[model samples]
Target: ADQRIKVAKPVVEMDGDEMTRIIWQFIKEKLILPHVDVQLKYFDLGLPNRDQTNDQVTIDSALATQKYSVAVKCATITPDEARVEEFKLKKMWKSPNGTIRNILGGTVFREPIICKNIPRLVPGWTKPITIGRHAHGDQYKATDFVVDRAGTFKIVFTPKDGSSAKQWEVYNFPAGGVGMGMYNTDESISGFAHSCFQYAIQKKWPLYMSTKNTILKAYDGRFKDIFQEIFEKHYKTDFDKYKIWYEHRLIDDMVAQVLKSSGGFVWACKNYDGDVQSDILAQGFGSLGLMTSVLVCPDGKTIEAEAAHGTVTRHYREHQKGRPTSTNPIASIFAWTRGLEHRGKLDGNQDLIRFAQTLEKVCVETVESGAMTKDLAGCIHGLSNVKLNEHFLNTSDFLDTIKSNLDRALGRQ
Candidate 1:
């Protein structure tokens, strides 16, 4: 090893499970360790080990991310019924993501890395679209009840200061009525909104915040109000001078507008919309493997990066056997680059920054040159038309190809 680049700060590395863990190892050895001198404050977040520590490791890792200001995560499962039996857990644990997000307290940005050779089903999509999801509140954290008899239902807010309680008539329950109250904190909303604006301004891309304010003006209207206030106060001048713009749009019209516009822009969505619409972007574009996510703090400094998709368990099952698999490692690879680049910016390591950029170009251009894994190959050729030989390379070979490409790119430098 020539010791080409050195990174001073350590990344909080979170190890995950299944196929992604396998891919993570390959990437670290083949691409990263060979190029940059870096240290990992490693934490094991695999389900079995999580069960072993009662998910103490996940909590510790999140806390570490707060301390270090950067983390790169592997795809770990949020267990349900099937996983419960499979992993044989102590109890049903909450999602590692939800837990980490509670600590992170900001926005999740999902950007699909566009491969020029990769077809965008939405033609004329030469530019990449980034979705800024306010990943807090909504059905995720709600309190609801069903009443069998007629009664007055009211929302009572009791101050911790022992002040007069403010009460509102949420509903008058007729015979059998159900009432639900969703919880959203001003702190989280403010943080999420600022992060979105910061990201759009950084990208120099136009920003659109979506809300269904017509019927639920007083409620959803609050989201629009805060975004507007913040934009005008902080980002408006920058948006104007940078030749970009920010606007709020109705969810109904916004959906139509997104499908119609095929190039660059950023969409800021309320809590539930981020989950639903980000999926639509992946489905329409049909390359979730290339999709990467980042957890951005309000100050725009601290962060965590990961694959927007999940651990490929089915493919992992096949991989355990004698069978060879051609799995996509692009998102996992980007997680490292994204994290390193964040460190590069934060630490002002131009040498590290250049190394990260070089690795990214090598990875993307390898895919462009048609030395891709089975996933992208499946999209290019019909899934049925795909063969292991003529189309896809097994996982190891695929990574090896990228490793060689990266070496050549570095050699020229």
Candidate 2:
């Protein structure tokens, strides 16, 4: 502790639920505090606390991130009916992720953690395929309703300057059907485009933004046009300097290309497309346990990093029963490194940057050295046949292994 590297700034720390919460504690106490001395602006986003705070804590965490410019989060639960009853809440609360992203407006980029020993479903993905999803508007925020009566679905736009209104009849339903009206603003679209372009330049990977512009000529075309405009206007020179290009692909073609192509490029997706395609990439890469999610704001400096996977409920249940469980904490650990690295870059702390990079190296090296959790071991050996201790370490041992390896990497051993 005496010789630990001092982080000049504070980082917003949002604690979460279940097995990952337990893992989060071990990470902060053992892995982090041992090497780095930093002030953590802690906010408990655990379900019970969120309910207690009326989810005010989640909002405060986002505001704190705005002030600090970096946040490292633990995996949290998005409550459903089952959780509502179990937790005995006042009402079912919305997803903490949804709330945070709404408050902190940005795109979510999910990337997989690759290890030499882990076998990928798509063996050609030797590197990472980062997906930046435009999370504003589209289906996630659509005005949807089911109608049975015969009526016209119409939209009207009124000018505040008292000009004549513009109206369009979307459709005339003859019978029972469902109708949805979705929209995206140039402001939000511009922000999304900038964030994607900025992230791509950072990764030095070519960027492909996908949309079904051929069909929704006006709606989706706005996205394609916005990205192209921003790329050429602001990011073209930087893209050229890095020898990376940005292109527009039809959604169908983009999906096919993503399936067959080798990794190491950034794919920008619309809200619905990103929701569907990111899951595909998550599974395609290997395990959700290895996926990391970062919400990159348009400012390029503010970010919130967390594991892409949910809190491991199954493993938490087993742990509650006093049974050892093998849950991967690599993504959780990466959440810290990513945030710390960004902090290092922001504050010009090379030592903090080096420490973050070294810890990341230790994690991958440890996995390559054949010490991993059950999920990763299953990627090598079949899940049905993998045995504990012989093949994979339980949660505690795996984390201990990471700490020891990190210590050795830092020349503390």
Candidate 3:
């Protein structure tokens, strides 16, 4: 049980802030280091550290992943007035995840852990519905403005090879109005298709790419075209072998299907759709506390795993005041396993892979067997008039419970 299995390669560890930052050490100490002989190339991605390093650490870490190929991370805090003054940062920093997403060009695969014993708003959702969000350009990086009087607003696309520039006359405003333009690319759409198909094949689940192609032929149609082209060109045979196929869904149609369909497929979405749907899915499926996110490269080798939830700032506040917090650590713990599991698979370390699986099982089994955090407890038990000792544990105690469960599970190995 105490043997440290050898890992032949290195994995990056992106550290963050708050209660999750505190829980990470507990995970490494009790669950990882004691059992796995692996080197964690550490990057301090905590807010203050990010400020201190001028956020170069994020780019370096993203670049490093291409070299080392495995990573796990926690959520950092957004700088408020309080944090800004305390850290005395040069300026506000954009999220490290967005920076890494840009650097990595990866698709986000979100899976909400469905606990059998924990009933959701809809019990028919007995399984996980994986959502792949295209985590790159679109409205997220758009420029917008209120048009002034007698102004011409045009959206223009210039070609590089001496071809004529194609332009759209958005508006010729004699009066005041608002105007905006957005974009998508074949490069990222193709990359996204690769990962979505890769994930669907792994799960043996059908892939559904959603778009508004019926209306926006060129704009949205590009995504549909690329996915179909990528699917037919590269993934069709394997996808057919798995008895699963890929299809395009109009955004309206996909929305309808998603709500009615039994939950066991990957829903590919646009940047905004993915963003909006994921939050709603998190709420309806369960809590952000139980959600896990992994960035799967098109190559199917390098991956970055982390909790979908950000730093539990509210929980951090309680902990800061010497109060008890029952913040969920399940997602953060899974991040480590997820990275390690894929790394093991890449290196063919069966013991390491098995250990990661065992650790994951220990976490789920612990919860299903009725030992869980306040968020999950609220689902299984009830949030209304909740009591402490009867249902939930302090943040540290809950982590302790998972470790004990992991220990006992590994003891069997």
Candidate 4:
């Protein structure tokens, strides 16, 4: 009799630059390649390369993700003024993620990695709280104009059929106050609600959508109404079947509850809240090194997972200077695990999912065994005793350790 082997799904790889690029090689060679036999479609998005390619690489990568239905990304820079000077970029390109999300029509969800030994700023968090932000319209997008002291302002809504125009006095601008108008489409809000419900069911956690409905009656009220309408119309059945409930919360009340709770829930946020709250959640959970980001499409069929932290430029620079650096690789590793686990589940490859789970366990066990990088050590007992190499493994070494442990867990060696 001949032994048989199962083939792995191909993972499209979008390579990045700065500190994370260095870690990227170690991760692929030491952690991923050793355990999984699969094809990698590589696209280098280095600063110089992106400039030469005119940033077409981001579009290509997004398309690849759409085709493959899954992608694992290393952190890349969202260039700013300083980056422009450093890279001598041809132009200040918008974030690759922003462009990708615009094309993909999805919401980005961020979740922190919680460990028992690690001390969080908010100490009550025992499980991860994932936040899915509806990334379109609302505050992220608005139309504005400065009205003259005596000028009258009005808003008009004209039906496309030209039946009639409805008008209202928006504001008169008495003194120094500013005025602006924003809008959200019924379609976008409905899509956002579906994505939130889908994610909550996937995680098997209660879903809460937060908005300031009481304050911005019409503007925020639309959001509340849309979610409720969707929940009742489409999601109520699925949510009930899963034994989970979908509810709305006032922004202030939700924030208070989030702070006081022990985690294990998904909070679906609007564009602005997601942007701000993600940072607060990342910092509060201890380090961005442990944060994982996933972009879930409205249909819940596509996803792209990546570490929330940017490339470790400082540590990469140190490595460039012939210095050994203790950079954490946990979140990056999880990016691969989570992406693969998702792919496995979608394909009904239970063995692959098990492999992912075991790999993740090895990572957690490795850290808990007291062999972790400086960032994790800082979280463990503060930075005072976090000596380099003594308390942590360098990028290659840490990943190699994980490979060895994973092999052992799988009974391969």
Model 4 lowest lDDT segment of ten: 1-10
Candidate 3 lDDT over residue span 1-413, tens digit each:
54689999999999989888877777787778888999889999988888888989989899888789998998777677777787798878877887887777768888887677767675556668989999777876677777767888887778999899998887789888888877767888888988888889989999999999889898899999899998998999999998998999999888878777778899998878988888767767777777778887766678899876877778878889998788888888889999999999999999999999898888888888778878888886689755676787777777778878887887786
Candidate 1 lDDT, 1-413, residue by residue in tens: 48657788989999999989988998998888878888899999999899999999999999999988999999999999889999999988778887887777688898787787777777755677889988777666677888899999888889999999999997787779788888777778888888888889889999999999997888788888899999999989999999999999999999889988875999998868887888778756768888878888765789999876889988899989967678899889989989999999999999888787887888889989888888888888877887875788888898899989987888898
**Every model's Cα RMSD, please?**
2.3, 2.1, 2.4, 3.7
Output the TM-score of candidate 2.
0.94
Candidate 3 is scored at a TM of 0.92
What is each predicted model's overall lDDT from 0 to 1? 0.86, 0.89, 0.84, 0.80
Question: Model 1 TM-score?
Answer: 0.93
Off by over 4 Å in 4: 1-9, 138-183, 237-244
- In model 1, the worst 10-residue window by lDDT is 118-127
* Residue range with the least summed lDDT across 10 consecutive positions in model 3: 118-127
Stretches of candidate 1 off by over 4 Å are 1-4, 143-154, 168-180
Sorted on lDDT, best first, the list reads: 2, 1, 3, 4
Query: Distance from true position, residue 37, model 2, in Å?
Result: 1.9
Per-model clash counts, in order, read 0, 0, 0, 0
> What stretches of model 3 exceed 4 Å from their correct place?
79-88, 144-150, 173-180, 238-242
Q: If scored against the real structure, what TM-score would every candidate get?
A: 0.93, 0.94, 0.92, 0.86
Where does candidate 3 clash, by residue pair?
none
Ranking by TM-score: 2, 1, 3, 4
Candidate 4 — which pairs collide? none
Q: Is candidate 2 or candidate 3 better by TM-score?
A: 2
lDDT of 2 by residue, 1-413 (tens): 28999899999999999999988998888899888999999999999999999989999999999999999999999889999999998878877887787767779888877787787888777778999988677776667899998899999999999999999998999988989888878988899999889889989999999988889899989998899998989999999999999999999999988888988899998877887888888888887787778888867689999876879899999989999889999999999999999899999999999999899989999999999999999988999989999999998899999888887778853
- Flag the better candidate by lDDT, 1 or 3: 1
Candidate maximizing lDDT: 2
